[PDB]
Write a protein that binds this DNA or RNA. Sequence first.
RNA 1: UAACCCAAACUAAUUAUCUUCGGCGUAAAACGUGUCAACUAUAAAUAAAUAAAUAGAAUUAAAAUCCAACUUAUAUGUGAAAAUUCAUUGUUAGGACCUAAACUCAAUAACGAAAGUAAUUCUAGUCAUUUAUAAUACACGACAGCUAAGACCCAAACUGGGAUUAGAUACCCCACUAUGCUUAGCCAUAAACCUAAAUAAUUAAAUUUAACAAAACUAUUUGCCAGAGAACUACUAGCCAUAGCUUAAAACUCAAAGGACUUGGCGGUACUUUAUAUCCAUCUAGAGGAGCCUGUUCUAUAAUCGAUAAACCCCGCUCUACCUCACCAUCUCUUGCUAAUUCAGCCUAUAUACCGCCAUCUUCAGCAAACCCUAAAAAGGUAUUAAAGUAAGCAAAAGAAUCAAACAUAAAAACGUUAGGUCAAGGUGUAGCCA
Lengths: 134, 108, 299, 50
Amino acid sequence: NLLKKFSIRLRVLNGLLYKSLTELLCTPQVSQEVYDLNVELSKVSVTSDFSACRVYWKTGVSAEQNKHTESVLQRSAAYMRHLLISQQTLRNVPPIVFVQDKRDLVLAEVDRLLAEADFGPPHRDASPRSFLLG
Amino acid sequence: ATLNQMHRLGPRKEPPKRLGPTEGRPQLKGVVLRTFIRKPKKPNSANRKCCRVRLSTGKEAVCFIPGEGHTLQEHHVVLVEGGRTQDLPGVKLKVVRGKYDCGHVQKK
Amino acid sequence: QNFLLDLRLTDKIVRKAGSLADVYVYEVGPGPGGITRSILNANVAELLVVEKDTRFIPGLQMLSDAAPGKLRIVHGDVLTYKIEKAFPGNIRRQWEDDPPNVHIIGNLPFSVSTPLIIKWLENISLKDGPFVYGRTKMTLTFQKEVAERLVATTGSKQHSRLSIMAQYLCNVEHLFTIPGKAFVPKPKVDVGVVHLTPLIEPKIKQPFKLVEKVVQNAFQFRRKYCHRGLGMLFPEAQRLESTGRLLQLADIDPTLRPTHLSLMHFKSLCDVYRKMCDEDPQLFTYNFREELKQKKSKG
Amino acid sequence: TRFLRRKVREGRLKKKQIKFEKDLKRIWLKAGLKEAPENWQTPKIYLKNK
RNA sequence: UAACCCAAACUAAUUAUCUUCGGCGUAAAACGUGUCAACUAUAAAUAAAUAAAUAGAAUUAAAAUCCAACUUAUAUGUGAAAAUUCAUUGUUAGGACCUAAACUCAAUAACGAAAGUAAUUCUAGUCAUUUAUAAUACACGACAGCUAAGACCCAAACUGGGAUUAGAUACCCCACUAUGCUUAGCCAUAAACCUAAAUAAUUAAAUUUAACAAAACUAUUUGCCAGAGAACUACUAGCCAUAGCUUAAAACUCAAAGGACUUGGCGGUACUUUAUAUCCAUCUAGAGGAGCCUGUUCUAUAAUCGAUAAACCCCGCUCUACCUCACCAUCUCUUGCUAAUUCAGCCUAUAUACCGCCAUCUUCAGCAAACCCUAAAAAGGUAUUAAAGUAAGCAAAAGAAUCAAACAUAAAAACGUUAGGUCAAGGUGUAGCCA
Ligand SMILES: [K+]
Ligand SMILES: [K+]
Ligand SMILES: [Mg+2]
Ligand SMILES: [Mg+2]
Ligand SMILES: [Mg+2]
Ligand SMILES: [Mg+2]
Ligand SMILES: [Mg+2]
Ligand SMILES: [Mg+2]
Ligand SMILES: [Mg+2]
Ligand SMILES: [Mg+2]
Ligand SMILES: [Mg+2]
Ligand SMILES: [Mg+2]
Ligand SMILES: [Mg+2]
């Protein structure tokens, strides 16, 4: 038994899913590893069909740090979906997929360059009938 | 059911066979009242020739007229028989060709 | 919303509405224009349609070209657009005269149909708005069971505020119910077609807001002894005495349930309630869901 | 049409009472009594007694 | 027309002849729960001592609520706002209240006939009939609902205010009510389902005895079922119920209704990787404006035809002054190309009858015959430290071409998709014209 057993609306779902997943990742509720990653969430984008849910997490500088964060986050995404249905945030939640967002690195970059910038001064076949004949 | 339950109930109750359009009679005689067309249920598409008749029993029924072309008119006499018209819903009677005013299809 | 794309049924709807020849018809929410086409082909003298969605205006304008001088299109809300002078004043008739040559027909969403009829029911009491022409008839679509309540009789499980408010101002007849399968998007409930004709003499002759309050307070608890609901009209300090006086004067057994209150029963209640409101004007403004909020030491 | 149902219910129960009363009159009349037993009054069992 | 069947009959209509040892998880059917009778079967002389059954009384830890002190200028609320709010807010090892509900334990599986029952304490309390088998009797029966008097912390149908939209009586926010609580009466309904009637067996009958659930099967007793809709309906009867509850048809109409499985699809496959002169970005020169050249459409002419979204538009044409020519006007010929032919000829209609030669997805990666295996197969057939798959084709690859070598370019690219294009390259089916 056990082995066999085992527009406006999208705005509301996208914002609330972001509002809730940020809370799940601020505590060890999902896992102690997920808590230590100190992951930040750029935004959540739910598809029109609701087949999947995109979670954009602010990527970092180190590829190794990002590769580890991706693996840990993905493994817990299935469990994270359980926590939102169990706390009654949303009755139905799509499979949560974790996507990278490297804009945060770009956002810091612009300010550094901009400050240094020089602005300048201001039927018949099937039947046996054929066969039986000969 | 247990043998005690079969004993208390005996043989299964058999409701009597329901009578049909002719009321358990080979044929009936009726007087034509109107001649009209009935449309067969889709997918069938035709203009089937029928007539309303007052049977000897006193009721009024719709009877399909078989054959290619009939000369029936109001006040004519016909001998109806059983047999349902499958495409025509409610038409459970048919006219007998060659009896009383109704005549055999005119082979031409 | 739910649209009707079957031209056969729109023609059937116009056929159920009766002869529209030479009649000034006001159509609400024409949308694709399936009903508009049927009305235009019914020898209508003049047809005015109000569509709030601009996407459907080009389709209506194209239909207007197909019927030169027979279709008028306004990009507005039916709930706000005023038709008092849309049609010539010579077709206006007295309230006691036969219904004028004005008939309002239309298939609207159920979000819009309920507020539109409530506003028009007040207009019938006021004899203004679309009813300046007289006792104009309205053939409007509603949810199947909302229409049942608009026609439900005393004691009916569907008997509610819709029954008393609609019936006391109009003769309400449920023409037929349209299956939902043909509507896009598909509704999970059928659509009932209701015909409403204003009455020459209203069953109750009191301000519309007064009747609405009395009807609402009576039917707040449908399964309770009406004396329960009527009590909420009066402040608690005078509720017991006033409720006893109201029922004593209206000649209604305090144990009769709201559903068993006929139209004549409410008339007696409204007539007695009208006198009480004249004795105390502050009574008319009392709200039980706000006095109790402000009773807990509002300061 | 609930109003009619209550109307039909109150008229159906009245006929149900008359049938009950008549059935009681048949019994004593057949037995040979010319008046119902002394101190007997047919109980009204279908009216709003409860 | 032929054949077939029966035959002094033959064919239609009507009626009759065939009658329960079968079932009740998912298809008709165990129908809320227990107890007492009479039969029919059965045969043993026990039980209980159990953690949250049940009723009563008392009790209270956390969190609220209220009053008071101090106190920010805000508080509240959403994805974002609005409404609401400053008589608010935060803090209080301050006071009052004892309303309502019982965290962790509980990853436990106890109690009770079922419904149901888990804060603590105390009181009362579950227990022996051999067993199965009961209604027209008795006693119970979640939630919701009614009646009367209370309670009211919070929640809350509904109602009102605020948002939303092409508009939602929706979903969301705030306020508040019936109600959820208590004490007395009533209502008797749940997918009241472990969808499993209750008992005593057995694990072998070389028994998946459909399939999915929960291995199968035997005996006993009762209840229930007999194609579907009509129908949790009509009527009858009982009932503190009065739209209800329980009981429950017929006419009618049809050849299905229904159950479990397996597949294929498209839906919104919008999701993650992906394209590579590409979807956006980057780069270069253009087109879009003017003048002409050329195709097409339109207008239009007595005056071709075909192509005509991607995959037509310098297209059939690597080519129209006559010819070409198939078009139009006007005049002329009638065995009128050939050895023969009541024949020659026909750019006459259908590319939706085709051959032929192609466009397209496309330099896409599939198409897969014959065998073998399966507690039967509607289909499937992989594991490499290998578990039922195998040995051959077609395309790809390879090979060859661009005259060393590579790379690149050409060529190649199956089966299907578009009844895609072409009867006017030619041939041809069918139909049509012959002074
Ligand atoms: K509102
Ligand atoms: K071809
Ligand atoms: Mg069943
Ligand atoms: Mg308490
Ligand atoms: Mg004790
Ligand atoms: Mg309350
Ligand atoms: Mg009956
Ligand atoms: Mg063509
Ligand atoms: Mg030429
Ligand atoms: Mg020439
Ligand atoms: Mg020619
Ligand atoms: Mg080579
Ligand atoms: Mg190759």
